PDB file of C-alpha atoms and ligand atoms in Angstrom:
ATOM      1  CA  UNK I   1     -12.819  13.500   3.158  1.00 44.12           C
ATOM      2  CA  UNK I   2      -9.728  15.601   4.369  1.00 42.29           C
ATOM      3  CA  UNK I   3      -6.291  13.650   3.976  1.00 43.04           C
ATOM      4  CA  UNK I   4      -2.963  15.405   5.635  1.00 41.28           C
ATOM      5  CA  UNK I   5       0.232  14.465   3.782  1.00 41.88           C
ATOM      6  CA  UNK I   6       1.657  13.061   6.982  1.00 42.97           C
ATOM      7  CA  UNK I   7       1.930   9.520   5.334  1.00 43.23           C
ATOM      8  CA  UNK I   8       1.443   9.070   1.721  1.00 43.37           C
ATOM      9  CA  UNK I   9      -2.011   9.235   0.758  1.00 42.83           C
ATOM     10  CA  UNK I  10      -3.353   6.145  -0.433  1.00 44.03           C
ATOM     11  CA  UNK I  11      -7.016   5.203  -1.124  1.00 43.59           C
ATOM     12  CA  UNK I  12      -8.774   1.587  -1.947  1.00 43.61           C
ATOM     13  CA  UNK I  13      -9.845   1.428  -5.815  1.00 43.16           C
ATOM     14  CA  UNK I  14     -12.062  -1.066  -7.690  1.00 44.82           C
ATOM     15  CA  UNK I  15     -11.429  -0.942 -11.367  1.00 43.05           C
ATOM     16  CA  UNK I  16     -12.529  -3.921 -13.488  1.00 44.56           C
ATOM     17  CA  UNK I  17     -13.665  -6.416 -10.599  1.00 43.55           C
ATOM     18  CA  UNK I  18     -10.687  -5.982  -8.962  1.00 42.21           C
ATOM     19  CA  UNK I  19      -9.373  -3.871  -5.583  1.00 43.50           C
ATOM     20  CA  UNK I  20      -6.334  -1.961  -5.279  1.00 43.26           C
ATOM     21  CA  UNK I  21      -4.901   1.165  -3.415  1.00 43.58           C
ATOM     22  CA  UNK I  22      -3.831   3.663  -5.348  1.00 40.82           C
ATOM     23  CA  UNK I  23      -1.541   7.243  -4.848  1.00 39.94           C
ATOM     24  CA  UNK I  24      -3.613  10.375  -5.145  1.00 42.77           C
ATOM     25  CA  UNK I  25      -1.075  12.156  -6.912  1.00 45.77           C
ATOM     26  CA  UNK I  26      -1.393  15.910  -7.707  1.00 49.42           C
ATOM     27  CA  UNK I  27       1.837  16.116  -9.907  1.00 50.48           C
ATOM     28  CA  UNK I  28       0.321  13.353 -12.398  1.00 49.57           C
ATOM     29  CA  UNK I  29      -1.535  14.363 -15.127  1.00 47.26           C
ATOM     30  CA  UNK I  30      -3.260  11.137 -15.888  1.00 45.29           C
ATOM     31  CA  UNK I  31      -3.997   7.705 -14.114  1.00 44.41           C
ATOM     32  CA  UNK I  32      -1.488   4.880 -14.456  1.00 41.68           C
ATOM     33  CA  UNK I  33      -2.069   1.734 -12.717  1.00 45.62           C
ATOM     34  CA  UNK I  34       0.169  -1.379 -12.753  1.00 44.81           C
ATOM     35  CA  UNK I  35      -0.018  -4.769 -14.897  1.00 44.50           C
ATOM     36  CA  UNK I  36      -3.321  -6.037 -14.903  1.00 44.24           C
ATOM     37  CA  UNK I  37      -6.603  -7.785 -16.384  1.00 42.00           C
ATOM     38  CA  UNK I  38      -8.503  -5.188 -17.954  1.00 44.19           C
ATOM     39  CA  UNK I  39     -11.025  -6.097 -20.852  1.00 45.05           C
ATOM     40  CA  UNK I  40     -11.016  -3.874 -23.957  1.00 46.69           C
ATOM     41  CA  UNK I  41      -8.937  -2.561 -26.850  1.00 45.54           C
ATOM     42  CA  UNK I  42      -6.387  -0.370 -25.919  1.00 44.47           C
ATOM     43  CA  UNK I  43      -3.610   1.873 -27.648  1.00 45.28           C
ATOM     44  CA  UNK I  44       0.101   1.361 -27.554  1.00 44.39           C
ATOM     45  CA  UNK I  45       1.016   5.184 -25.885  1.00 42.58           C
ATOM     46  CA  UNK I  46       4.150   6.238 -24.334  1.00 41.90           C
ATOM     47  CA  UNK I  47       4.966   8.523 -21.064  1.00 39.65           C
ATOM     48  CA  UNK I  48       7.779  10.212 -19.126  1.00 42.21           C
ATOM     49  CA  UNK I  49       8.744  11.075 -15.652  1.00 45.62           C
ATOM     50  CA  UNK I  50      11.147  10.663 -12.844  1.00 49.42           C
ATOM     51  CA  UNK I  51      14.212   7.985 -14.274  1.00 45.70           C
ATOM     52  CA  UNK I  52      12.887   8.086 -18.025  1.00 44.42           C
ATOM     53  CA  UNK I  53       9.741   6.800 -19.823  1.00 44.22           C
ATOM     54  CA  UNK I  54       7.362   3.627 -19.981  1.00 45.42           C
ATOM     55  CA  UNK I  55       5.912   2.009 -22.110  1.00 45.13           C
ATOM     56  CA  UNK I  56       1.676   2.186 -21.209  1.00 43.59           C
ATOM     57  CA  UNK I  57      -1.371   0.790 -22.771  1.00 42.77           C
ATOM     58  CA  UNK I  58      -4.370   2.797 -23.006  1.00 43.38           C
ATOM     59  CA  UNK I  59      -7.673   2.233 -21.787  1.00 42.65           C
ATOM     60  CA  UNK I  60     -10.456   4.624 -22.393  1.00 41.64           C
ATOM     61  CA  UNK I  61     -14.035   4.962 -20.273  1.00 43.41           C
ATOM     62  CA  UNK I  62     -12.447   2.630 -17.673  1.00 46.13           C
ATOM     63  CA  UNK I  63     -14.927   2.882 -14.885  1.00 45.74           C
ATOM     64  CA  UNK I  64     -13.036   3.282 -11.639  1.00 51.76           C
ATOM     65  CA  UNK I  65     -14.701   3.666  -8.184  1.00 51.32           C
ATOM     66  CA  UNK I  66     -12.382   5.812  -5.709  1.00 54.05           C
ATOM     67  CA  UNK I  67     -13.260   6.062  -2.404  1.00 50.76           C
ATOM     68  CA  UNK I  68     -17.140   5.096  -3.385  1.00 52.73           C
ATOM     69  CA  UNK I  69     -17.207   7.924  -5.658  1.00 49.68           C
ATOM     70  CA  UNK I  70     -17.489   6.570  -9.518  1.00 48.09           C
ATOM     71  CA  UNK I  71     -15.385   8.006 -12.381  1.00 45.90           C
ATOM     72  CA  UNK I  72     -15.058   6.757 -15.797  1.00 45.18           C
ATOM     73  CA  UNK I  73     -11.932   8.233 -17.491  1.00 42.32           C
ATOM     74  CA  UNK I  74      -8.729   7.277 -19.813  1.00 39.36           C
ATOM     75  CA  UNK I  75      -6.324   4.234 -17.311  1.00 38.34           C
ATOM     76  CA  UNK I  76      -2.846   3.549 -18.408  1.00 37.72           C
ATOM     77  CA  UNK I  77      -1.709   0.221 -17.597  1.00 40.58           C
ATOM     78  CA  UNK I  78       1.797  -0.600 -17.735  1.00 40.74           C
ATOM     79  CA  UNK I  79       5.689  -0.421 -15.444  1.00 40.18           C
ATOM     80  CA  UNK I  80       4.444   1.469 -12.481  1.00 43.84           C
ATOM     81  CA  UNK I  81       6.268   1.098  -8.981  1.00 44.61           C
ATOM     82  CA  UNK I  82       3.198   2.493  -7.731  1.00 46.75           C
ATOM     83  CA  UNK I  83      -0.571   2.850  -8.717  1.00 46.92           C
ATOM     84  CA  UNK I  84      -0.955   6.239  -9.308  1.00 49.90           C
ATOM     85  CA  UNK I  85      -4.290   8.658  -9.938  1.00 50.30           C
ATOM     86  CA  UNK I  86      -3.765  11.429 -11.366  1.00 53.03           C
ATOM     87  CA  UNK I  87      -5.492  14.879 -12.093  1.00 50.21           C
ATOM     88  CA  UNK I  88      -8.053  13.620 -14.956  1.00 47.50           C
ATOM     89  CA  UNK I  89      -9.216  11.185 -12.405  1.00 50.93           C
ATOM     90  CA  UNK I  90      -8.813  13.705  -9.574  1.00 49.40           C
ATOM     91  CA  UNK I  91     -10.742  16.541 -11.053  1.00 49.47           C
ATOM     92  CA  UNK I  92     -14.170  13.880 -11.500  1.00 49.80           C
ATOM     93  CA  UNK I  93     -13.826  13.347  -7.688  1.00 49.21           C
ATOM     94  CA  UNK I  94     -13.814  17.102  -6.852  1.00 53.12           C
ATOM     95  CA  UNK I  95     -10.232  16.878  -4.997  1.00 50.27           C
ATOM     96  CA  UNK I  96      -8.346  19.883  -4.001  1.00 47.56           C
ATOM     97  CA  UNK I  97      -5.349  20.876  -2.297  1.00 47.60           C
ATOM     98  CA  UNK I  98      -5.525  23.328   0.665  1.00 48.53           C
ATOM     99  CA  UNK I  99      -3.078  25.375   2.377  1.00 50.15           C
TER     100      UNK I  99
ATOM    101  CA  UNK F   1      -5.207  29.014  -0.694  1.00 51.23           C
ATOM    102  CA  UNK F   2      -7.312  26.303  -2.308  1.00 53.42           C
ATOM    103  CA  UNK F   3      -6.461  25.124  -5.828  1.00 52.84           C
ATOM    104  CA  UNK F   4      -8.579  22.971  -8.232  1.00 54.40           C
ATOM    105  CA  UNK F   5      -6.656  20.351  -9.891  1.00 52.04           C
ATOM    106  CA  UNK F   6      -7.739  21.080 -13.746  1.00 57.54           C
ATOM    107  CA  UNK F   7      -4.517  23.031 -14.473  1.00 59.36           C
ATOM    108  CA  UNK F   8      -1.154  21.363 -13.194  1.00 58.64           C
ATOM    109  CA  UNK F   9      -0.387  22.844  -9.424  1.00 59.32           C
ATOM    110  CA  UNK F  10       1.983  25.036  -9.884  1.00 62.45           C
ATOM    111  CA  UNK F  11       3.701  27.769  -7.260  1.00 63.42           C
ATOM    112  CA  UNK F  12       6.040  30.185  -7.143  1.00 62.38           C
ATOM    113  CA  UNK F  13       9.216  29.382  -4.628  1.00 59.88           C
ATOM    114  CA  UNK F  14      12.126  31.221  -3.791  1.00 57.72           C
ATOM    115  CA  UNK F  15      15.281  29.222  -3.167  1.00 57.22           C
ATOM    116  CA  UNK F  16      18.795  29.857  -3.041  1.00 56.31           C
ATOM    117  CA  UNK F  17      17.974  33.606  -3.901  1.00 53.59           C
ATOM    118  CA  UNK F  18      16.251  32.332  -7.272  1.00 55.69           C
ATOM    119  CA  UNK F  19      12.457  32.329  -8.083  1.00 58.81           C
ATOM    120  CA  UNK F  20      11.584  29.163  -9.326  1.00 60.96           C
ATOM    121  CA  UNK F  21       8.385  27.607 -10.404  1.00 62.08           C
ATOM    122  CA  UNK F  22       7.345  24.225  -8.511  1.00 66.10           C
ATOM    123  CA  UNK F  23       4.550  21.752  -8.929  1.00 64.30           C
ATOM    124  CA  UNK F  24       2.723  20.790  -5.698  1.00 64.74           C
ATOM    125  CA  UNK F  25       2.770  16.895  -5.504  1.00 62.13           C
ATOM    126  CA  UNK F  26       1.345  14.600  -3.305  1.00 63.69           C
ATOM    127  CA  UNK F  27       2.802  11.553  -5.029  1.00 61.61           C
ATOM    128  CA  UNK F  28       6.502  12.710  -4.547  1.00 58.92           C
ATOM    129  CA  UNK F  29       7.531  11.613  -0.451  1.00 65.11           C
ATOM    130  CA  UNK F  30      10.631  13.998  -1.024  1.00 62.70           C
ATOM    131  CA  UNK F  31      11.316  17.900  -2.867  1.00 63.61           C
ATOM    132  CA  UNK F  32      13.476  17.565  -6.140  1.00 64.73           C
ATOM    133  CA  UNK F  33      14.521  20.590  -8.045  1.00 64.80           C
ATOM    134  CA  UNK F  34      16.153  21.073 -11.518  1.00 63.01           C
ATOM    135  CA  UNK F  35      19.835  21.144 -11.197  1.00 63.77           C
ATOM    136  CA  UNK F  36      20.338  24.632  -9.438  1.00 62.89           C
ATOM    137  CA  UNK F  37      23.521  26.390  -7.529  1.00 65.56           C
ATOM    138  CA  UNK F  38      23.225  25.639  -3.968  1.00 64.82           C
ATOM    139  CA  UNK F  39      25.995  26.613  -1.266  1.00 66.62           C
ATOM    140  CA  UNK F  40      26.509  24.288   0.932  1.00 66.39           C
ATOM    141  CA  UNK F  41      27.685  20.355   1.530  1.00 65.27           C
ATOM    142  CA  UNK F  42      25.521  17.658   0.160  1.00 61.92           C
ATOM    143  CA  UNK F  43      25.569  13.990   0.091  1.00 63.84           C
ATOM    144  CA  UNK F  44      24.951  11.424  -2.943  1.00 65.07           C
ATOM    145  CA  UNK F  45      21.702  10.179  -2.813  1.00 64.98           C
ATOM    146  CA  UNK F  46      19.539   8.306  -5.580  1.00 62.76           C
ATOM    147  CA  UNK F  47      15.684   8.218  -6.779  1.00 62.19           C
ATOM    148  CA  UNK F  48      13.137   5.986  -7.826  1.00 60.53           C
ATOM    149  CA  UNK F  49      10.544   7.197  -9.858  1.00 58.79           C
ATOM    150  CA  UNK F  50       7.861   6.230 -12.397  1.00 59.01           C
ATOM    151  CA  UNK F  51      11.023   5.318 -15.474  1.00 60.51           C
ATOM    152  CA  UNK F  52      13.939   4.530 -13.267  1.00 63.01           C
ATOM    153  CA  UNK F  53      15.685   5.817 -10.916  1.00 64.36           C
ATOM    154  CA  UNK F  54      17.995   8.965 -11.052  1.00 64.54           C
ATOM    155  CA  UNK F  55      21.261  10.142  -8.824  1.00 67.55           C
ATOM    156  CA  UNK F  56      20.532  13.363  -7.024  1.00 67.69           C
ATOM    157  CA  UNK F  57      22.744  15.395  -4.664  1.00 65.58           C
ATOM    158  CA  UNK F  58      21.005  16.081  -1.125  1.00 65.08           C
ATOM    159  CA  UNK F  59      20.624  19.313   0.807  1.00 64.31           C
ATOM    160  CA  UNK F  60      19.828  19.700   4.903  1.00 68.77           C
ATOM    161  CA  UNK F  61      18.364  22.056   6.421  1.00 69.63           C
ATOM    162  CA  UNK F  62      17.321  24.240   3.299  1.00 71.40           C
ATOM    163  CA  UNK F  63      15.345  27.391   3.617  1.00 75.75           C
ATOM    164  CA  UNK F  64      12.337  27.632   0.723  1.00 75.61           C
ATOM    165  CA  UNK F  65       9.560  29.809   0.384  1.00 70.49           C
ATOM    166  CA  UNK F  66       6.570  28.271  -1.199  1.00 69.27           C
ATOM    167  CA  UNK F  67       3.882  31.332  -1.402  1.00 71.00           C
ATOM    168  CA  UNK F  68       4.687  33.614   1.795  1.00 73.70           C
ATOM    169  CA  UNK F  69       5.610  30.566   3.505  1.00 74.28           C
ATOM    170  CA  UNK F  70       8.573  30.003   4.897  1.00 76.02           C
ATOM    171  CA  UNK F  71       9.876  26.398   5.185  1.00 78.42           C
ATOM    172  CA  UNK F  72      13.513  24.126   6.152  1.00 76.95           C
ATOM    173  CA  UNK F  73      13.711  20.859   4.607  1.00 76.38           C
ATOM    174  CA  UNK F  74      15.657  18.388   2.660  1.00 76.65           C
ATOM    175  CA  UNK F  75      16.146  19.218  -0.888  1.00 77.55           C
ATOM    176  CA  UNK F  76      17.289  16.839  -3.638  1.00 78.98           C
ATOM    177  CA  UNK F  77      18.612  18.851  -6.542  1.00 76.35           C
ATOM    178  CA  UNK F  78      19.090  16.328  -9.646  1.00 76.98           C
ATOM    179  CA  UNK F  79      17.951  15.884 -13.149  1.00 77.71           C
ATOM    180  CA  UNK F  80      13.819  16.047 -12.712  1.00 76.05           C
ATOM    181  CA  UNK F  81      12.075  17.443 -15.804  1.00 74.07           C
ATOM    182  CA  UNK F  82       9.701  19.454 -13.211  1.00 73.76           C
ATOM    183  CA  UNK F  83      10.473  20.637 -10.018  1.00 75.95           C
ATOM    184  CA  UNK F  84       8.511  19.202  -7.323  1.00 77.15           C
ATOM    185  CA  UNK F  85       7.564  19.775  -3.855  1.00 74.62           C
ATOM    186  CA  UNK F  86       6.930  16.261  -2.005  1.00 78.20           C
ATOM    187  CA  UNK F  87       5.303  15.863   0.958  1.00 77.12           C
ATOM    188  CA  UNK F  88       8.634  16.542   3.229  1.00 78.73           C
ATOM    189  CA  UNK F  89       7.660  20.072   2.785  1.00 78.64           C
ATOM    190  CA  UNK F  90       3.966  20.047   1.821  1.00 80.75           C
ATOM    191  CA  UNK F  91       3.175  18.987   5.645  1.00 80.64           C
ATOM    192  CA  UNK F  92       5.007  22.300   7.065  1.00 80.49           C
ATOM    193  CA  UNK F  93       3.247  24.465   4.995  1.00 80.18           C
ATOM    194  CA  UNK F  94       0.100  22.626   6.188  1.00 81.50           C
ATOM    195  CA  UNK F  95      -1.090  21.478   2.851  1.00 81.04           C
ATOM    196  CA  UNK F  96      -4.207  19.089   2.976  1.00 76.49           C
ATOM    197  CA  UNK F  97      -6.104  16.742   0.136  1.00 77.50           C
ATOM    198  CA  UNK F  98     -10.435  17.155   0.272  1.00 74.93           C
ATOM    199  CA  UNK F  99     -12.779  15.556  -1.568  1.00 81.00           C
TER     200      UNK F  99
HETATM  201  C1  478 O 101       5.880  15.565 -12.179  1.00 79.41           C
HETATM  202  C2  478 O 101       6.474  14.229 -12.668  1.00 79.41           C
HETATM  203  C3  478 O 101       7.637  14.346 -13.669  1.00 79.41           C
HETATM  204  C4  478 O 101       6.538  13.114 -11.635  1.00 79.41           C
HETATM  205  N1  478 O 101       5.239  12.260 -11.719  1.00 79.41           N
HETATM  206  C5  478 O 101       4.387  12.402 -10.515  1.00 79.41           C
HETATM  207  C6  478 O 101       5.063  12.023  -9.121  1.00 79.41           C
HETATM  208  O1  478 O 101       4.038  12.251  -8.216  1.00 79.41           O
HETATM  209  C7  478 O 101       5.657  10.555  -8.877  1.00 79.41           C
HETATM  210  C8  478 O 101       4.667   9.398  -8.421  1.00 79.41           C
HETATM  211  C9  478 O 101       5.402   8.113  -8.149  1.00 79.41           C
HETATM  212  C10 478 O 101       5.773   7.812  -6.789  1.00 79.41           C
HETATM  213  C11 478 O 101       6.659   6.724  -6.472  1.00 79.41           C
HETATM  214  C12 478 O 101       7.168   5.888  -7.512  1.00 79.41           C
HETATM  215  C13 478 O 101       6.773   6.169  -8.897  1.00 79.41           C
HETATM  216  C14 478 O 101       5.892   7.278  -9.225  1.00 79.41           C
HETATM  217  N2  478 O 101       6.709  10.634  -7.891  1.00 79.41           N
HETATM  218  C15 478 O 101       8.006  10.509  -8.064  1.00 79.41           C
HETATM  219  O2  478 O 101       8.615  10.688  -9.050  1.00 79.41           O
HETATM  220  O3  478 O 101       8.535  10.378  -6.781  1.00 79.41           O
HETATM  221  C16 478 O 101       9.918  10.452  -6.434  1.00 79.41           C
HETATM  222  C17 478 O 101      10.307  11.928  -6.355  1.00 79.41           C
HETATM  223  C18 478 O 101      10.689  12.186  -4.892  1.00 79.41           C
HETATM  224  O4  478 O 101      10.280  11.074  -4.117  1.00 79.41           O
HETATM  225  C19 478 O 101      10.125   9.937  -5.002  1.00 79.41           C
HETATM  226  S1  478 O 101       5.155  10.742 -12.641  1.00 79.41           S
HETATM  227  O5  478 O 101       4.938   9.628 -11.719  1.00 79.41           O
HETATM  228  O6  478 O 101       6.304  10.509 -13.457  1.00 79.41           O
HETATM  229  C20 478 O 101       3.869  10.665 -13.763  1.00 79.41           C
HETATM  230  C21 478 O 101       3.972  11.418 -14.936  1.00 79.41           C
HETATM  231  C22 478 O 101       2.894  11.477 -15.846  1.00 79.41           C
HETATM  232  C23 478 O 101       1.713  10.779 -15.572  1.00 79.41           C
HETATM  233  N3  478 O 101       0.751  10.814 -16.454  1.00 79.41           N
HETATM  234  C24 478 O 101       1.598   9.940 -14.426  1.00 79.41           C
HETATM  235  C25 478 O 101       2.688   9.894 -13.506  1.00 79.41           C
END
């Protein structure tokens, strides 16, 4: 669909038997979601922003629906104000900006 | 113009009299650039973002051109590592999200 940036563009999620809206969020490279029950071995990795960086564990081939649309891809887990989905999520989708 | 998301968004803007280099992002609700000179009165003003929050000083009324467009807005100039338009300006130079 089309989304104007009126109001922050959020979407409904189900990752891992679970629903959640999520930030589509062109200035994040990859998808970090917030505390949660995911099943699978992940790695300790670590990432910056805005205020510093977090702590994250990763998940990889984490199959995420968006919008209906599947996408399997690397999820961080881990201190996130908001659940965000970034660019290598983004790209699977086929979401651009316009202007 | 429409941009694919596999390379990070970036655009030129001209602020200030400068030429900067800004990331388009639809996860940020408000513009934050590098620490920059800027004339002008601003007020105190502090962020949240994904590893804390950080102090910024806020601008009114700002002119910025992203591409050949011309836009006034609030600008928070602070300690980002990236400079970022948020969607404060990204709806007056009538920006959009498809997929
Ligand atoms: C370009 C960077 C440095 C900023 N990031 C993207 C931004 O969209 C980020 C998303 C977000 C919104 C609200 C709360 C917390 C996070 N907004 C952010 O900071 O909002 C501030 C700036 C003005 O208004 C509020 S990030 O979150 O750090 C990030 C970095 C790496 C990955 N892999 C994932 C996320």
């Amino acid at each position: 669909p089309q989304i104007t940036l009126w109001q922050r563009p959020l979407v409904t999620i189900k990752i891992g038997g679970q629903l959640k809206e999520a930030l589509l969020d062109t200035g994040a490279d990859d998808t970090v979601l917030e505390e949660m029950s995911l099943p699978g071995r992940w790695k300790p990795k670590m990432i910056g922003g805005i205020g510093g960086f977090i702590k994250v564990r990763q998940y990889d081939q984490i199959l995420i629906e968006i919008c209906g649309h599947k996408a399997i891809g690397t999820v961080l887990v881990g201190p996130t104000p908001v659940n965000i989905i970034g660019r290598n999520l983004l790209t699977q989708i086929g979401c651009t900006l316009n202007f």
